[PDB]
Tab-separated table of C-alpha atoms and ligand atoms in Angstrom:
chain	number	residue	atom	x	y	z
A	1	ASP	CA	117.525	256.113	11.578
A	2	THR	CA	119.174	254.733	8.262
A	3	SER	CA	121.144	257.040	6.987
A	4	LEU	CA	123.952	256.971	9.815
A	5	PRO	CA	125.192	253.167	8.735
A	6	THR	CA	125.626	255.029	5.214
A	7	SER	CA	127.456	257.702	6.977
A	8	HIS	CA	130.335	255.021	7.762
A	9	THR	CA	130.495	257.214	11.153
A	10	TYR	CA	132.330	254.739	12.990
A	11	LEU	CA	135.105	255.921	10.970
A	12	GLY	CA	135.050	259.583	11.129
A	13	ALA	CA	133.414	263.007	10.305
A	14	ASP	CA	137.440	263.919	10.096
A	15	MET	CA	137.556	266.479	7.163
A	16	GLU	CA	137.509	266.734	2.966
A	17	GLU	CA	134.928	265.961	1.170
A	18	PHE	CA	134.857	266.034	-3.156
A	19	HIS	CA	131.673	267.439	-4.849
A	20	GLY	CA	133.419	267.309	-8.259
A	21	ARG	CA	131.985	264.977	-11.137
A	22	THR	CA	134.724	262.900	-12.845
A	23	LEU	CA	132.964	260.804	-15.686
A	24	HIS	CA	134.411	259.374	-19.062
A	25	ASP	CA	132.796	258.804	-22.341
A	26	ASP	CA	131.593	255.939	-24.291
A	27	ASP	CA	133.915	252.999	-25.625
A	28	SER	CA	136.673	255.460	-24.375
A	29	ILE	CA	139.865	253.418	-23.224
A	30	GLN	CA	141.429	254.701	-19.719
A	31	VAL	CA	143.838	254.048	-17.426
A	32	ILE	CA	143.071	253.775	-13.939
A	33	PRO	CA	145.464	252.297	-10.995
A	34	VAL	CA	144.121	249.188	-9.076
A	35	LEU	CA	144.446	248.878	-5.080
A	36	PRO	CA	145.974	245.704	-4.180
A	37	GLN	CA	143.678	244.409	-1.447
A	38	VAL	CA	140.255	245.714	-3.016
A	39	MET	CA	138.900	241.939	-3.873
A	40	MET	CA	135.087	243.480	-3.606
A	41	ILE	CA	132.848	243.132	-7.169
A	42	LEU	CA	131.465	246.965	-6.625
A	43	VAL	CA	128.619	248.457	-9.038
A	44	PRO	CA	127.415	251.812	-9.855
A	45	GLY	CA	126.179	253.348	-7.028
A	46	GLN	CA	128.175	251.232	-4.285
A	47	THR	CA	129.860	252.941	-1.592
A	48	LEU	CA	133.065	251.531	-0.580
A	49	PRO	CA	135.363	252.590	2.586
A	50	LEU	CA	138.664	251.713	3.376
A	51	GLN	CA	141.266	252.152	5.524
A	52	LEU	CA	144.978	252.117	3.888
A	53	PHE	CA	147.567	251.786	6.263
A	54	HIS	CA	150.828	251.030	3.521
A	55	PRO	CA	153.042	253.403	2.364
A	56	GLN	CA	152.674	252.543	-1.351
A	57	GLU	CA	148.944	252.293	-1.381
A	58	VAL	CA	149.180	256.033	1.159
A	59	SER	CA	150.495	257.354	-1.592
A	60	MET	CA	148.576	256.736	-4.897
A	61	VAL	CA	145.534	257.202	-3.253
A	62	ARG	CA	147.197	260.391	-1.839
A	63	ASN	CA	148.389	261.516	-5.453
A	64	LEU	CA	144.391	260.215	-6.431
A	65	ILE	CA	143.252	262.970	-4.255
A	66	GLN	CA	145.081	265.657	-6.948
A	67	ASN	CA	144.038	263.950	-10.036
A	68	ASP	CA	140.734	262.663	-10.948
A	69	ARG	CA	139.772	260.496	-6.981
A	70	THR	CA	138.969	257.397	-9.096
A	71	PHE	CA	140.420	253.975	-9.603
A	72	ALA	CA	139.573	250.273	-11.135
A	73	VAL	CA	137.889	248.046	-8.737
A	74	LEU	CA	137.851	244.996	-10.193
A	75	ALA	CA	135.714	242.192	-10.642
A	76	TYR	CA	138.061	238.901	-10.277
A	77	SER	CA	136.478	235.482	-11.461
A	78	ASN	CA	139.880	233.507	-9.615
A	79	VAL	CA	141.138	236.417	-7.361
A	80	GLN	CA	143.737	233.997	-5.795
A	81	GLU	CA	145.164	234.793	-9.412
A	82	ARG	CA	144.328	238.461	-9.846
A	83	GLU	CA	141.577	236.844	-12.325
A	84	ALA	CA	139.375	239.650	-14.044
A	85	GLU	CA	137.635	241.033	-17.223
A	86	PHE	CA	135.163	243.353	-15.942
A	87	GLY	CA	134.938	246.053	-13.381
A	88	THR	CA	133.877	249.462	-12.055
A	89	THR	CA	135.720	252.680	-11.543
A	90	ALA	CA	135.965	254.297	-8.351
A	91	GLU	CA	135.704	257.914	-7.666
A	92	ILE	CA	136.263	258.791	-3.652
A	93	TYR	CA	134.013	261.480	-2.629
A	94	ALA	CA	135.139	261.473	1.438
A	95	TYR	CA	138.413	261.306	2.918
A	96	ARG	CA	141.162	261.873	5.569
A	97	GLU	CA	144.329	261.503	7.015
A	98	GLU	CA	145.391	259.873	10.337
A	99	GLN	CA	148.794	258.894	12.450
A	100	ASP	CA	149.027	255.661	14.200
A	101	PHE	CA	152.566	255.034	15.127
A	102	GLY	CA	154.248	257.182	12.928
A	103	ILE	CA	152.507	255.548	10.398
A	104	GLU	CA	150.561	257.454	8.130
A	105	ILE	CA	146.657	256.510	7.588
A	106	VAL	CA	144.210	257.324	5.528
A	107	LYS	CA	140.683	257.015	5.756
A	108	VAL	CA	138.458	256.851	2.404
A	109	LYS	CA	134.664	256.873	1.428
A	110	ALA	CA	134.506	255.668	-2.712
A	111	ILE	CA	131.365	255.165	-5.032
A	112	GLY	CA	131.138	253.044	-8.118
A	113	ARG	CA	130.809	255.061	-10.965
A	114	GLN	CA	131.316	253.654	-14.773
A	115	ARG	CA	131.840	249.798	-15.411
A	116	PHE	CA	134.136	248.480	-17.891
A	117	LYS	CA	135.913	245.129	-19.968
A	118	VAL	CA	139.412	244.686	-18.510
A	119	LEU	CA	141.593	245.272	-21.880
A	120	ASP	CA	157.200	250.948	-9.091
A	121	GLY	CA	154.588	248.063	-8.418
A	122	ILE	CA	151.516	249.914	-8.429
A	123	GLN	CA	149.279	248.309	-11.532
A	124	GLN	CA	147.630	250.213	-13.733
A	125	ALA	CA	144.437	248.664	-15.539
A	126	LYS	CA	143.570	250.009	-19.588
A	127	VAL	CA	140.093	249.592	-19.578
A	128	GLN	CA	137.375	250.096	-22.042
A	129	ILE	CA	134.115	252.445	-20.470
A	130	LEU	CA	131.160	250.262	-20.983
A	131	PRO	CA	128.047	252.399	-22.281
A	132	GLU	CA	124.521	253.085	-19.390
A	133	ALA	CA	110.632	248.278	-18.648
A	134	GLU	CA	108.226	249.398	-16.027
A	135	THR	CA	106.987	246.403	-16.009
A	136	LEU	CA	110.231	244.783	-14.396
A	137	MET	CA	110.294	246.743	-12.073
A	138	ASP	CA	107.533	246.650	-10.795
A	139	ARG	CA	107.750	242.636	-10.600
A	140	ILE	CA	110.550	243.036	-8.761
A	141	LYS	CA	109.903	246.135	-6.370
A	142	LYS	CA	107.019	243.426	-5.950
A	143	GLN	CA	108.870	240.213	-4.320
A	144	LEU	CA	111.431	242.834	-2.711
A	145	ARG	CA	107.934	243.679	-1.322
A	146	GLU	CA	107.683	239.721	-0.209
A	147	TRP	CA	110.644	239.413	1.429
A	148	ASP	CA	111.034	243.245	3.688
A	149	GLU	CA	107.553	244.799	3.933
A	150	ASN	CA	110.218	248.603	4.583
A	151	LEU	CA	110.915	247.831	0.694
A	152	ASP	CA	111.003	256.455	-0.766
A	153	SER	CA	113.660	253.372	-0.206
A	154	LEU	CA	114.447	252.333	-3.866
A	155	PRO	CA	115.979	254.494	-7.259
A	156	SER	CA	113.209	255.135	-9.955
A	157	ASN	CA	115.512	255.282	-13.056
A	158	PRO	CA	115.364	251.917	-14.607
A	159	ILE	CA	119.148	252.389	-14.882
A	160	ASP	CA	119.848	252.941	-11.222
A	161	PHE	CA	116.926	250.348	-9.759
A	162	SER	CA	119.189	247.285	-11.827
A	163	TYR	CA	122.695	248.156	-9.717
A	164	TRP	CA	120.315	248.497	-6.314
A	165	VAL	CA	119.682	245.158	-7.345
A	166	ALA	CA	122.569	244.030	-7.919
A	167	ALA	CA	124.237	245.576	-4.812
A	168	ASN	CA	122.025	244.051	-2.219
A	169	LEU	CA	120.829	240.824	-3.613
A	170	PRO	CA	121.982	237.090	-1.842
A	171	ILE	CA	123.949	235.852	-4.582
A	172	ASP	CA	127.113	234.182	-5.458
A	173	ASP	CA	129.455	236.344	-6.581
A	174	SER	CA	129.568	234.638	-10.164
A	175	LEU	CA	125.770	235.986	-10.477
A	176	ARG	CA	127.056	239.055	-9.508
A	177	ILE	CA	129.409	239.195	-12.303
A	178	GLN	CA	126.736	237.982	-15.132
A	179	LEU	CA	125.536	240.843	-14.050
A	180	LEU	CA	127.687	243.612	-14.325
A	181	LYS	CA	128.784	241.829	-18.193
A	182	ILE	CA	124.940	243.162	-19.306
A	183	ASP	CA	125.184	246.118	-21.654
A	184	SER	CA	121.325	246.803	-20.868
A	185	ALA	CA	118.882	248.076	-17.976
A	186	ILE	CA	116.728	245.534	-19.485
A	187	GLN	CA	118.112	243.191	-19.928
A	188	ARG	CA	119.706	243.619	-16.144
A	189	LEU	CA	116.437	243.621	-14.688
A	190	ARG	CA	115.119	240.228	-16.066
A	191	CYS	CA	117.935	238.399	-15.337
A	192	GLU	CA	117.516	239.832	-11.458
A	193	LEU	CA	113.805	238.437	-11.517
A	194	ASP	CA	115.198	235.071	-12.662
A	195	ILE	CA	117.570	235.461	-10.169
A	196	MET	CA	115.566	236.326	-7.544
A	197	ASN	CA	113.380	233.761	-8.280
A	198	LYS	CA	115.939	230.413	-8.139
A	199	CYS	CA	116.992	231.458	-4.783
A	200	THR	CA	116.843	229.647	-1.172
A	201	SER	CA	118.275	229.588	2.072
A	202	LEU	CA	122.164	230.588	2.447
A	203	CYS	CA	124.550	227.909	4.028
A	204	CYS	CA	127.716	228.317	5.795
A	205	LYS	CA	130.720	228.522	3.531
A	206	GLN	CA	132.697	226.039	5.114
A	207	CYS	CA	130.685	222.722	6.259
A	208	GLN	CA	127.369	223.817	3.189
A	209	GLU	CA	125.246	221.619	5.498
A	210	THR	CA	123.020	224.161	8.359
A	211	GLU	CA	121.096	226.734	6.314
A	212	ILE	CA	121.526	229.746	8.635
A	213	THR	CA	119.424	232.142	7.071
A	214	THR	CA	116.361	232.736	3.948
A	215	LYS	CA	115.630	235.639	1.957
A	216	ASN	CA	111.929	236.287	3.327
A	217	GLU	CA	114.448	237.447	7.290
A	218	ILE	CA	116.500	240.339	5.093
A	219	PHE	CA	115.421	244.096	6.145
A	220	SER	CA	116.987	246.874	5.557
A	221	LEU	CA	118.462	248.734	7.812
A	222	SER	CA	119.951	251.772	5.875
A	223	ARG	CA	118.795	253.923	2.733
A	224	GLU	CA	121.968	252.546	0.501
A	225	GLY	CA	120.332	248.830	1.266
A	226	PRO	CA	120.238	246.292	3.034
A	227	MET	CA	123.805	245.211	1.809
A	228	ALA	CA	126.755	246.980	2.476
A	229	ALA	CA	130.343	247.441	3.260
A	230	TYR	CA	131.771	248.137	6.340
A	231	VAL	CA	135.272	248.032	7.158
A	232	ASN	CA	137.179	246.984	10.725
A	233	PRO	CA	139.843	248.854	12.521
A	234	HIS	CA	142.571	246.337	10.719
A	235	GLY	CA	141.381	247.583	7.603
A	236	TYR	CA	139.447	244.604	6.027
A	237	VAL	CA	136.492	245.260	3.827
A	238	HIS	CA	133.204	243.566	5.607
A	239	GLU	CA	129.643	242.931	3.304
A	240	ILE	CA	126.961	242.619	5.703
A	241	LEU	CA	123.455	241.589	4.685
A	242	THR	CA	121.229	242.416	7.235
A	243	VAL	CA	118.079	239.830	8.791
A	244	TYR	CA	115.997	239.612	11.784
A	245	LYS	CA	116.149	235.672	12.208
A	246	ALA	CA	118.958	233.544	11.927
A	247	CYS	CA	118.751	229.772	12.743
A	248	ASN	CA	122.002	227.690	14.091
A	249	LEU	CA	124.104	230.554	15.134
A	250	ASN	CA	125.713	230.011	19.039
A	251	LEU	CA	126.492	233.837	20.207
A	252	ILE	CA	130.722	234.171	21.592
A	253	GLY	CA	131.313	236.723	23.737
A	254	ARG	CA	129.723	239.584	25.292
A	255	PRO	CA	128.574	243.116	23.693
A	256	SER	CA	130.930	245.339	22.912
A	257	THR	CA	130.119	248.986	20.858
A	258	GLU	CA	133.428	250.200	20.105
A	259	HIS	CA	133.583	250.807	16.324
A	260	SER	CA	129.643	249.238	15.654
A	261	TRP	CA	128.997	249.991	11.923
A	262	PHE	CA	125.588	250.879	12.718
A	263	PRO	CA	125.330	253.382	15.585
A	264	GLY	CA	123.174	252.945	18.431
A	265	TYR	CA	123.382	248.744	18.433
A	266	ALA	CA	126.047	246.703	20.162
A	267	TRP	CA	127.790	243.497	18.483
A	268	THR	CA	128.951	240.348	19.044
A	269	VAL	CA	130.531	237.288	17.483
A	270	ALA	CA	127.817	234.472	16.044
A	271	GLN	CA	129.058	231.358	15.494
A	272	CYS	CA	127.885	228.641	13.239
A	273	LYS	CA	126.888	225.911	15.365
A	274	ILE	CA	128.439	223.027	12.644
A	275	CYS	CA	132.105	223.305	12.227
A	276	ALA	CA	132.770	226.868	14.848
A	277	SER	CA	133.659	229.389	12.031
A	278	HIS	CA	132.816	232.793	12.188
A	279	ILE	CA	129.559	233.921	10.359
A	280	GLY	CA	129.130	237.072	11.767
A	281	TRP	CA	127.505	239.355	14.420
A	282	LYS	CA	124.163	239.599	16.415
A	283	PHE	CA	123.374	242.599	17.288
A	284	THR	CA	121.764	244.626	19.895
A	285	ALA	CA	120.235	248.385	20.409
A	286	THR	CA	122.107	249.999	23.168
A	287	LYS	CA	118.746	251.527	24.850
A	288	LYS	CA	115.294	250.139	25.618
A	289	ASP	CA	113.186	252.518	22.695
A	290	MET	CA	114.826	251.337	19.664
A	291	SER	CA	114.018	248.977	17.565
A	292	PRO	CA	114.462	246.264	16.245
A	293	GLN	CA	115.912	245.082	19.744
A	294	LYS	CA	118.042	242.718	18.203
A	295	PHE	CA	119.164	241.741	14.582
A	296	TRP	CA	121.776	239.867	12.590
A	297	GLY	CA	124.672	241.353	10.438
A	298	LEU	CA	125.926	237.909	8.584
A	299	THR	CA	129.224	238.251	6.350
A	300	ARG	CA	128.564	237.746	2.512
A	301	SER	CA	131.715	235.996	2.736
A	302	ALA	CA	130.630	233.115	5.319
A	303	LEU	CA	128.049	231.960	3.231
A	304	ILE	CA	127.339	229.493	-0.066
A	305	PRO	CA	123.984	229.503	-1.155
A	306	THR	CA	121.976	226.119	-1.040
B	401	LVY	N1	137.923	245.725	17.572
B	401	LVY	C1	137.554	244.536	16.744
B	401	LVY	C2	139.228	243.984	16.515
B	401	LVY	C3	138.595	242.415	15.326
B	401	LVY	C4	137.817	243.093	14.468
B	401	LVY	C5	136.862	243.436	14.876
B	401	LVY	C6	136.623	244.658	15.259
B	401	LVY	C7	135.592	245.801	15.513
B	401	LVY	N2	134.762	244.558	14.334
B	401	LVY	C8	133.579	244.747	13.701
B	401	LVY	C9	132.778	244.680	14.877
B	401	LVY	C10	131.064	245.004	14.506
B	401	LVY	C11	130.857	245.943	14.194
B	401	LVY	O1	129.830	246.876	14.034
B	401	LVY	N3	131.889	246.850	14.089
B	401	LVY	C12	133.182	246.438	13.394
B	401	LVY	O2	134.188	247.247	12.828
B	401	LVY	C13	135.629	243.483	13.600
B	401	LVY	O3	135.462	242.735	12.847
B	402	ZN	ZN1	129.343	225.691	9.634
C-alpha cells in the first residue's frame, strides 16, 4: 500500500487531528513564527513532519495549537546565513505530546498552504502572502509516464499539479526556489517541462564524480509522491527520493526495521564507493509476498546533479 508512507506511522497514530482551515488573503501581510531548525524548501500541499526536542520550540508549537497552527517555512538561499526571500506557510494538521527523560517532546505533521515573499529569540517573519494550460499538463503527465509507468496518482487542478511537480522533481534547491518565485500556474508548468527536459543523472555531492541513479529509475511508493520528507529518531528531517536501481552504492550493516519510514520494509545504510559518504538507504520487504522486493530511498542532500 501507498497511503502508509504518507501516514508517518513510524512516528505513531498518537492523538489529536485538526480539521480546521486557516487561510489568509491576497497581498495580505502576516506575522508568522519561523522554526529555527527547519532548513527544507516547502511548497503548498507538501507534508512536513517534525520532532521538536527543545523547550522554546516546544513552547511556540504548543501556543500555536491554541492560535492558527500556522508557521512560516523559509526558502533559504544561503541557509548557513538564514538568507531567504520566499517561503510557504505551514499549518499543523496532526499533533502529539510525549515525554522521554523528563524532556517534553512534540511530534507534529504539517502541510504547505500559502506562499509569500519575505518582508525571546523566537524570530518572527512579516510576509506578503502571494496570490494563486491543459496542454502543458499533458506534456508533463506524459514524460512522467516515461519515468515511472505507475504515474489517479496525479492532481487535476493546473494550480495543484504544478506544486506536485515542484515538490517531486530531483532538482537543485536553486530550481525549487525559482519555481516558488513564479506567480502563475501556467508559467510554473512551463518552467517545469523545461526543467525535466534538461535533467540528467545525479552524482553524489561530495566527490561529484560517480553517477548514482537517473530520472528513469524514479518510481512512487506513496500517494503524496516519489519524493517525501521523513524524520529519523534524532528529529532530523530527510528528503527521500525512491528509485528501483542505483549504481555504485555499497551497503553497510545488516537490515533493520526500527522506525522504518515505509511500513513492511527494512532499511540498510548505503555508501557511495568513491568517497565513502553515506548516500541513503537500500530497502528490503519483510515478506516474500510484497513488491518490489528491493528499492533505494536516497537523500536529496547527498546528490548533486551532473
Ligand atoms: N535508529 C536510527 C538511528 C540513527 C539514524 C537513523 C535511525 C533510523 N533512521 C532511518 C532509517 C530509514 C528509515 O526508514 N527510518 C529511519 O528513521 C535513521 O536515519
Ligand atoms: Zn562520493
